[PDB]
Write an enzyme that holds these catalytic residues in place. Sequence first.
Site, PDB file in Angstrom:
ATOM      1  N   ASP A  64       0.818  -1.197   0.000  1.00  0.00           N
ATOM      2  CA  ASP A  64       0.000   0.000   0.000  1.00  0.00           C
ATOM      3  C   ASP A  64       0.858   1.255   0.000  1.00  0.00           C
ATOM      4  OD1 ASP A  64      -2.458   1.252   0.100  1.00  0.00           O
ATOM      5  OD2 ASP A  64      -2.974   0.411   2.077  1.00  0.00           O
ATOM      6  N   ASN A 112     -10.631  -3.232  -6.465  1.00  0.00           N
ATOM      7  CA  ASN A 112      -9.852  -2.173  -7.126  1.00  0.00           C
ATOM      8  C   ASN A 112     -10.432  -1.746  -8.480  1.00  0.00           C
ATOM      9  OD1 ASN A 112      -6.666  -3.375  -5.751  1.00  0.00           O
ATOM     10  ND2 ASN A 112      -8.010  -1.725  -5.023  1.00  0.00           N
TER      11      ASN A 112
HETATM   12  C1  LIG Z   1      -1.825  -3.908  -2.222  1.00  0.00           C
HETATM   13  C2  LIG Z   1      -2.970  -2.871  -2.174  1.00  0.00           C
HETATM   14  C3  LIG Z   1      -2.906  -1.830  -1.255  1.00  0.00           C
HETATM   15  C4  LIG Z   1      -4.179  -2.974  -3.124  1.00  0.00           C
HETATM   16  C5  LIG Z   1      -5.404  -3.559  -2.410  1.00  0.00           C
HETATM   17  O1  LIG Z   1      -6.463  -2.574  -2.232  1.00  0.00           O
HETATM   18  P1  LIG Z   1      -7.456  -2.811  -1.091  1.00  0.00           P
HETATM   19  O2  LIG Z   1      -8.917  -2.843  -1.589  1.00  0.00           O
HETATM   20  O3  LIG Z   1      -7.182  -4.203  -0.557  1.00  0.00           O
HETATM   21  O4  LIG Z   1      -7.170  -1.761   0.195  1.00  0.00           O
HETATM   22  P2  LIG Z   1      -8.206  -0.642   0.814  1.00  0.00           P
HETATM   23  O5  LIG Z   1      -9.103  -0.187  -0.308  1.00  0.00           O
HETATM   24  O6  LIG Z   1      -9.032  -1.162   1.974  1.00  0.00           O
HETATM   25  O7  LIG Z   1      -7.461   0.533   1.352  1.00  0.00           O
END
Ligand SMILES: C=C(C)CCOP(=O)(O)OP(=O)(O)O
Lengths: 283, 283
Positions: A64, A112
Amino acid sequence: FPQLPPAPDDYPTFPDTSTWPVVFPELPAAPYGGPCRPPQHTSKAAAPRIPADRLPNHVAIVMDGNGRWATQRGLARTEGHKMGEAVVIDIACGAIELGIKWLSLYAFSTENWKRSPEEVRFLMGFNRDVVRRRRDTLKKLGVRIRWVGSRPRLWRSVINELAVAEEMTKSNDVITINYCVNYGGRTEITEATREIAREVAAGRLNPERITESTIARHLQRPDIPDVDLFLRTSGEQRSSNFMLWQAAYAEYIFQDKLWPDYDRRDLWAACEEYASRTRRFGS
Amino acid sequence: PQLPPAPDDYPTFPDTSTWPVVFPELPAAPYGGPCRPPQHTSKAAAPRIPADRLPNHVAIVMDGNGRWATQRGLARTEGHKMGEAVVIDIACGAIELGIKWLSLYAFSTENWKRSPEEVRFLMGFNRDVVRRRRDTLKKLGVRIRWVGSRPRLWRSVINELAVAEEMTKSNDVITINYCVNYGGRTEITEATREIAREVAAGRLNPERITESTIARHLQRPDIPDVDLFLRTSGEQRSSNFMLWQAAYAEYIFQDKLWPDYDRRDLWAACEEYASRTRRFGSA
Ligand SMILES: C=C(C)CCOP(=O)(O)OP(=O)(O)O
Ligand SMILES: [Cl-]
């Protein structure tokens, strides 16, 4: 007693972030094959000596802070993601030096898709390219790498590059890297439930004999062990649906620094912390 | 959405000068129904946190009872005795702050690994606590019920909770999930089994199973996602608690041992929650 000794002083180093993509150095020939020693860190630090029984068997990392790192510098978020590639490979190298057997990396989650189309399109192409660009090196390091994730919406190109990486590295055994793309813990559990359902429909499974082990056996990659240590960077304290089934009993360590600032010494520091702690009853 | 601060004359809780802790008689509400909970001994008032920054659902792993007692030269069961008033105190504080859902990890499936003397104590203790406290919980407008797995759990524990559930089913100030013989993996497994039976009976097409199908077949399908996951004692593990529901929960790990804990600590944890940014995959 499982760490690689401190590398020869003149052994090639990694990463040199003065070029993009980063140049993975040519490594010295080994007298009789087998996996190559990974390049040592730029700092020439050596992995801490931790008994194999006290190491985490399986480390999961939520990588992250990439976008924030870029915005912080007045750059587009995709520029942070570019810097994260070198960090992934650095961490792979450091996991090998430490003797870690399983590493799971959260490259892209099923949530995402909520990001901008421009960012999603970039991450899809970037993960495709990173896999093609790095799998020959990973193979030569003795890394066994394969995709973990869900099929819907995920670019076929990404699946295809990881499938070749998987076939190329299927006999390697130094470390296994679960490269998790379009991964969601709830979805993976749902997919196992569906496979179980199909087996029941075919009569090959009595519903009354389903146990927790049945679920485990029907996950996409049933050989993945429990996560011991769950790391997340950028100061966020959440698991975000990563390795949901597998990390039920994991210990969490949350590190404040942003992924593009992260390096193998940071991995080692978290693993040392994990290893040093008196292991509590029932763990 | 907090209750306004109680009058300085309003009854207080907990008064630990006897055991078990006596719950004070309260005055009558304005027509209405539920009694205003007794304020804390310190007479401290809940922080003003807006509805949109407040957690709808808090999950608490009540950890450190045994070590609290050990530290003091006492049998571990004495620590559990002291934590009982803390549960009620936290219930009262949750209501004051405006928390709608509270899940408490009273007994895990892993706790069968403890001494039989401790397991027998904990079973009988939870039986007696629900019996001793359900009338008060009802008057406070608490809707309480059992969440957990049936095998091995004492029938008396399930029964006392079933009685409490029927008594409080129309209450709506707060819902407490009193989790006894609970395991996140187990709960999911039980859903999968329910789904498998339906498939075996010709009533469900495997290809139509989705994440929602799993959610609908969990023991208590009305439980919403966990927003804030709290654990005491400094231990940084979720330990299989609310596994499905806490996939995107924020974690706060507090060092305090459970018998030392009180509602002000809950509020502090909620203040920390209130200024974290949640993304659910976005940004
Ligand atoms: C390796 C990373 C940070 C990508 C995952 O986004 P996430 O959906 O798992 O994380 P948040 O939106 O809860 O911050
Ligand atoms: Cl130990």
